[PDB]
Amino acid sequence: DNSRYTHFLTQHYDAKPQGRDDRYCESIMRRRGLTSPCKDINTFIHGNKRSIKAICENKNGNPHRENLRISKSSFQVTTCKLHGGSPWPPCQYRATAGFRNVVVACENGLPVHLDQSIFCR
């Protein structure tokens, strides 16, 4: 069963994003179902899927902390951070685009979790 991988892609993958500004964040967070209630922080990885899956192997990854994996390559990413006091929609997001390696957890050679702690600031 690979539903967690599918869910990883829904929450954390966007191949070819359209301008990574606040309005990008506000739209994709709605489109991916992450606005009821408003997710506090969420990061999307860009580029191709095969590079992300490779983090699960020696090809593009190293072990990290307690049973996570950290990528060797750097990825284009965009972090969407909720602002305003309210947990409920409409959800306003601030976008932060970036370029660095990423931390995931893998199961059966597929990523199933993105460690959001490296994108908090």
Numbering used by the authors: 2 to 122
Question: Please, what does the article write about this entry?
Answer:
Angiogenin (ANG), a 14-kDa basic protein is an angiogenic ribonuclease and member of the bovine pancreatic ribonuclease (RNase A) family (also known as RNase 5). Like RNase A, ANG cleaves preferentially on the 3′ side of pyrimidines and follows a transphosphorylation/hydrolysis mechanism. In addition, the crystal structure of human ANG has revealed that it has an RNase A fold and the catalytic triad (residues H13, K40 and H114) is conserved. The enzymatic activity of ANG is several orders of magnitude lower than that of RNase A towards conventional RNase substrates, but essential for its angiogenic effect.
An important structural feature of ANG is that a part of the active site (i.e., the C-terminal region of the molecule) is obstructed by residue Q117 (part of the pyrimidine recognition site). It has been postulated that movement of Q117 and adjacent residues is required for substrate binding and catalysis. Mutational studies on C-terminal segment of ANG have also shown that shorter side-chain residues or deletion of residues affects the catalytic activity and previous structural studies have revealed that the segment containing residues 117–123 in the wild-type is highly mobile. In the 3D structure of native ANG, R121 forms part of a peripheral sub-site for binding polynucleotide substrates at the C-terminal region’s closed conformation. The ALS associated variant R121C has significantly higher RNase activity (131%) as compared with wild-type ANG. In the crystal structure of the variant, the smaller side-chain of cysteine appears to provide more flexibility for the C-terminal end of the molecule by destabilizing the closed conformation thus providing better access to substrates which would explain the enhanced RNase activity. Similar observations have been reported previously for the R121H ALS implicated variant.
